[PDB]
Amino acid sequence: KEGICLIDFSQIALSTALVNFPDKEKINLSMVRHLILNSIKFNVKKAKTLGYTKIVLCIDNAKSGYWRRDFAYYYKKTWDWEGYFESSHKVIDELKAYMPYIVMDIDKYEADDHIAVLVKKFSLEGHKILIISSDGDFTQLHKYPNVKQWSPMHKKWVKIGSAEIDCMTKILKGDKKDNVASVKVRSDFWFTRVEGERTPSMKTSIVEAIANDREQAKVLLTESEYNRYKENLVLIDFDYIPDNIASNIVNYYNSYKLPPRGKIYSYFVKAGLSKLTNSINEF
Numbered sequence: 001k002e003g004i005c006l007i008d009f010s011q012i013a014l015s016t017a018l019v020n021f022p023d024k025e026k027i028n029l030s031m032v033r034h035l036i037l038n039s040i041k042f043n044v045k046k047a048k049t050l051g052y053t054k055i056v057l058c059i060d061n062a063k064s065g066y067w068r069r070d071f072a073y074y075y076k077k078t079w080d081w082e083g084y085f086e087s088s089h090k091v092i093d094e095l096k097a098y099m100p101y102i103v104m105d106i107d108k109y110e111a112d113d114h115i116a117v118l119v120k121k122f123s124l125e126g127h128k129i130l131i132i133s134s135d136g137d138f139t140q141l142h143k144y145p146n147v148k149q150w151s152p153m154h155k156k157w158v159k160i161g162s163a164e165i166d167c168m169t170k171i172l173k174g175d176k177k178d179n180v181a182s183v184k185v186r187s188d189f190w191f192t193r194v195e196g197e198r199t200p201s202m203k204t205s206i207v208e209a210i211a212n213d214r215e216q217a218k219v220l221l222t223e224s225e226y227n228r229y230k231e232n233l234v235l236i237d238f239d240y241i242p243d244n245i246a247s248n249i250v251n252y253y254n255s256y257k258l259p260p261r262g263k264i265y266s267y268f269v270k271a272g273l274s275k276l277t278n279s280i281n282e283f
């Protein structure tokens with residue numbers, strides 16, 4: 001059973017670019033092609049050296065929004081961000097055309113989704129898994145056999161009882177960064193809040209009691225809070241990803257045709273990344 005590496009790509013490329021490309025300076029295609037290929041090399045190396053030889057780049061595609069928006073409208077509702085994303089979108093195309101990786105890219109599907117679903121499938125299928133991402137949410141998947149997670153900036157393992165509590169903490173208190181609100185407030189609180197508005201706190205003993213036995217949601221939460229809980233499950237909990245979303249990801253995965261590995265040399269050449277031709281072995 002081949003070792004598999006799922007990479008939270010879109011974020012890593014972007015995060016690297018935020019750190020490496022100077023503010024108030026234009027970002028060109030070369031810049032980003034260079035940046036992206038080097039990032040892949042560096043991370044593919046980490047993976048392969050450890051035994052995860054099948055690389056899957058998982059992309060964030062909110063071109064037409066998010067499937068989750070069909071459940072919660074408010075969900076997820078100087079630097080050359082323009083030049084970056086333009087060139088980046090182009091480079092992703094080249095990866096699909098020439099590089100030897102499965103590029104999980106689906107409009108309205110998040111990199112989190114592809115990882116959550118693939119990790120599940122493969123883990124249960126007997127493969128050892130590596131998640132390359134600093135996102136603590138992936139600890140929801142450590143519960144599956146042979147799942148490790150590596151954080152590429154600080155270069156370290158994401159290790160985590162505490163997982164169920166971390167998750168439950170988000171289900172109950174929300175996640176402001178994604179516009180997910182506490183079960184103690186109205187659904188679209190973050191999209192519609194007033195400056196004169198604050199979220200009532202959720203006591204830890206409750207969070208923990210539910211984390212430990214979810215049926216406790218029915219006694220510790222008021223009916224209102226409970227409705228909010230069930231809405232938050234789909235926004236936070238990977239196990240609440242719809243059968244249809246899951247199925248499409250797996251299909252995409254299975255129908256993916258990789259390009260002859262002989263195409264890389266040409267690409268590098270053609271794309272003027274000759275310094276890299278000497279390192280195709282590293283891809």
Ligand SMILES: [Mg+2]
Binds near residue numbers: 008060111
């Ligand atoms: Mg993500």
Ligand SMILES: [Mg+2]
Binds near residue numbers: 112137235236
């Ligand atoms: Mg999420």
